[PDB]
């Protein structure tokens, strides 16, 4: 593989970062959402509204049906598709085809709302209908002779880069800080503390790892559990100093508009445990990442029931290394994460963990 050829291989902002993938014989080009929060390679199989193209299995001579379907259901929506096998080519990075599993969607509800498929890059554990259905990245690692590592940069806050097989040095400056993967399903990592404008929230660190704290390129916003979300909102409102935001701004039902004072809004830092448990490092997002333009703006953080989801709101500030080989997630500040001549993210450390508990995951 060539890692330089994978630079700028993603398009979009916004509406998701998608990779160009060629499927079947002869190849059919599809636009595929890069999703580190799921583990199925699934594409559109029928026309549908809101999509331009789709994978026609009947036009691929190499396509083979497994003779079973898969139904995936989420909170908001769902889909059902035929499970098959076919040859796939990633032109930006590789020059050979790979045999992989593929789900071809024949029906869905609230799923397709520029991409026409999803590339699940999480672990075998989450694959449906079971973990025996070999994931795309497991097929690629084996068949392409690449290390069990990929890294992602989002430049939409300018597309992005998915480097399959390693780390590209030109995509970051400064040090990479690694946090352990606590559980291999989603990219679950341990959050120790949340800090708003220098002030730590007064919560038990178990509140941040509710069911799980995960790094998910397929989630748009920084999703926080309700209690944590309420604490962040209160801390942002207190630290802002200017006349107060609407409740509709916090809940996402109303936009806040200006003809904007970035200096008046606080920084949001997330502390992650280092591979050495005595130390931690923080990933910091400036106001420009969580007060998102739509000049009118929407709030880039939302509540959740289960899971603290480190979505695109945060990932747009950092080059994120999914080091599956060494069971860790790396973070470095993105040079492309710059708005109006100001770096919109920071990374720093080390910091002591002697106050907090040794295991914040329940």
């Amino acid at each position, epitope marked *: 593989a060539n890692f330089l050829a994978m630079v700028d291989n993603l398009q979009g902002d916004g509406r998701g970062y998608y990779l160009e993938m060629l499927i079947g014989t002869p190849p059919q080009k599809l636009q595929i959402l890069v999703d580190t929060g799921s583990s199925n390679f699934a594409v559109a199989g029928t026309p549908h509204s809101y999509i331009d193209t789709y994978f026609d299995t009947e036009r691929s001579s*190499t396509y*083979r049906s*497994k*003779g*079973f379907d898969v139904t995936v259901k989420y909170t908001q929506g769902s889909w059902t598709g035929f499970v098959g*096998e076919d*040859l796939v080519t990633i032109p930006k990075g590789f020059n050979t*085809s*790979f*045999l*992989v*599993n593929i789900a071809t969607i024949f029906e869905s509800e609230n799923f397709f709302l520029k991409w026409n498929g999803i590339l699940g890059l999480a*672990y*075998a554990t989450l*694959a449906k209908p*079971s*973990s*025996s*259905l*070999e*994931t795309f990245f*497991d*097929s690629l690692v*084996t*068949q*392409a*002779n690449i290390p069990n590592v990929f890294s992602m940069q989002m430049c939409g806050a300018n597309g992005g880069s998915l480097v399959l097989g390693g780390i590209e040095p030109s995509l970051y400056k400064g040090d990479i800080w690694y946090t352990p993967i606590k559980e291999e399903w989603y990219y679950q990592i341990e959050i120790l503390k949340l800090e708003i404008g220098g002030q730590s929230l007064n919560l038990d660190c178990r509140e941040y790892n509710a069911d799980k704290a995960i790094v998910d390129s397929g989630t748009t916003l920084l999703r926080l559990p309700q209690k944590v979300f309420d604490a962040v909102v209160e801390a942002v409102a207190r630290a802002s100093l200017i006349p107060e935001f609407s409740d509709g701004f916090w809940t996402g039902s109303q936009l806040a508009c200006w003809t904007t004072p970035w200096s008046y809004f606080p920084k949001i830092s997330i502390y992650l445990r280092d591979e050495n448990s005595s130390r931690s490092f923080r990933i910091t997002i400036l106001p420009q990442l969580y007060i998102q333009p739509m000049e009118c703006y929407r709030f880039g953080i939302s509540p959740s029931t289960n899971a603290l989801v480190i979505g695109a709101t945060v990932m747009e500030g950092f080059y994120v290394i999914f080091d599956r080989a060494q069971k860790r997630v790396g973070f470095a500040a993105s040079p492309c994460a710059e708005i109006a001549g100001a770096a919109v993210s920071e990374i720093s450390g080390p910091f002591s963990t002697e106050d907090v508990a040794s295991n914040c995951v329940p």
Partner: nanobody
Amino acid sequence: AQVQLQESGGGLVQPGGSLRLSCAASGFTFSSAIMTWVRQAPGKGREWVSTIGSDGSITTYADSVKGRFTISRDNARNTLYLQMNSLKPEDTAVYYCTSAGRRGPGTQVTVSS
């Protein structure tokens, strides 16, 4: 799913010799699983050998083994095979099966004059 794999059929052969590797599978629906052979020698990089689709019709090979090695499977017997012909000293490695991120312990192939 506990994907269990056990390879057999390796050995010490001369240059131009032959082996038939096999791999027994259990704990999953072998007839629906993509199967892959990989090789690994000490001090060298991991090398993909060949992949076979679940029904056996689709097969792919590395350029280093093309025309010499043949991959196949018997889904009724839950067994993957690698027929190895025209063996060279550079084919010396542990050969192992992989499926869905799991692998077998492998079987040693040694080619020496």
